[PDB]
């Protein structure tokens, strides 16, 4: 939900690191034209852990949101954006006709269709060089077949289903030898006392009965193992509740 959305030719990298993704308000916002997610599933996205997350923003027509796929080329998929074949993420696109598509025309929205070669995957090429679509050189001036690489969408509220403004938010999840920094693991049930119960604190598991706080833990401590190498004093990770096992 970003006003003045980033267009397709100048998609901004919004790298997410040292944050905890939720993957819930993403799905519960706006009627999505296409919630396709190749490589990874959005249902298990909250359970999967990734090292780094990139987010990119496109504004393209409804006939152009299907072009965003690995191994696919077109008006947008060859010169505006390219996808690496090891992509793990989603290709979520909106149907934003109310926010964009001014009656005077959203001529600020354009797309690139001139390039001397195919776009490299995960590469941005923002240039204002006059494209030599013909044989004669341009030399700055628009010669015989020298034109700007940009073409206007002219978004207005008279267009069709496949030609309305379409806001595409694509998420890229990358994992490597570094530890995962973006996850969604926030889930914690309420606790009980004086009951034979299995417990799982911060990954470490066990069973037994519980007792409230009585000892003198340090300002920083979480583990209260005794001489007998047995877990007997633990802290609640969400609220400062010292327990005895």
């Amino acid at each position, epitope marked *: 939900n970003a006003t003045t959305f980033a267009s397709v030719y100048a998609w901004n990298r919004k790298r997410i690191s040292n944050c905890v993704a939720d993957y819930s308000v993403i799905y519960n916002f706006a009627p999505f034209f296409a919630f396709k997610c190749y490589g990874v599933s959005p249902t298990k996205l909250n359970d999967l852990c990734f090292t780094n997350v990139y987010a990119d923003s496109f504004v393209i027509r409804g006939n152009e949101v299907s072009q965003i796929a690995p191994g696919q080329t077109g008006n947008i998929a060859d010169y505006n954006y390219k996808l690496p074949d090891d992509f793990t993420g989603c290709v979520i696109a909106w149907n934003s006709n109310k926010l964009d598509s001014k009656p005077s025309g959203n001529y600020n929205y354009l797309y690139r269709l001139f390039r001397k070669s*195919k776009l490299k995957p995960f590469e941005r090429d923002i240039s204002t060089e006059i494209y030599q679509a*013909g044989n004669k050189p341009c030399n700055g001036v628009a010669g015989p077949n020298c034109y700007s690489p940009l073409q206007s969408y002219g978004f207005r509220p*008279t267009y*069709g289903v496949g*030609h309305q403004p379409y806001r595409v938010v694509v998420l890229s999840f990358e994992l490597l030898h570094a530890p995962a920094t973006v996850c969604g693991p926030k889930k914690s049930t309420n606790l009980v006392k004086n009951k034979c119960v299995n417990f799982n604190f911060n990954g470490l598991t066990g069973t037994g009965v519980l007792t409230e706080s009585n000892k003198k833990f340090l300002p920083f401590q979480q583990f209260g193992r005794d001489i007998a190498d047995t877990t007997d004093a633990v802290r609640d990770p969400q609220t400062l509740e010292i327990l005895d096992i």
Partner: antibody
Amino acid sequence: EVQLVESGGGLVQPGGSLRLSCAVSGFTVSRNYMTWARQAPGKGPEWVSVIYPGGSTFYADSVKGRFTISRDSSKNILYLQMNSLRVDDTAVYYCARDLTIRGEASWGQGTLVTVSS
Amino acid sequence: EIVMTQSPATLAVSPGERATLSCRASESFNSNLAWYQQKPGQAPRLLIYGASTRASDVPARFSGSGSGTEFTLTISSVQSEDFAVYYCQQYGDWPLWTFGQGTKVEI
């Protein structure tokens, strides 16, 4: 000016193969979209195949899987190889540099491609 | 894809008179319609692109109007050279477009 000269057309039996050349004078075929347009004697024209400078080639619904569109940048010649021809492929073939978004257009003279047995 | 109909298909206007043609689309595109002129035995020549602007070395008589699923092409004064065939190409998904069927204008 832009001049497009089509050659290689003629009478070819259905189920055979043919190759058409399109000499282009005015620009480079590796930097322009070349449309290989058809026109019926009774009906109007249609789009059949398109090509991109990056190597992206597209075909129509009734012509896909049979045709090959190629470019010669040194010779500046657009080539079209057609295989498994049918009776419906008897038309007049043009090389079309439509480019109608900006507002300049150039169309070739074309050749009468006749497919019959 | 989007197809079109041309009304009327039996157009016949005398020389030196205003001429009217209408194109009705099947679906809605991004207001990208091209009026093309083809003479008998000739390559088609573009007149109007986007249904609002004339082409290079094209006289000011031809004018386009309308947006959406109905478009109107108006010729101010046909003088012995504009009697030809007109197509309303729909380049809303350009370069994937569709040309017309035939609008032979008779004297």
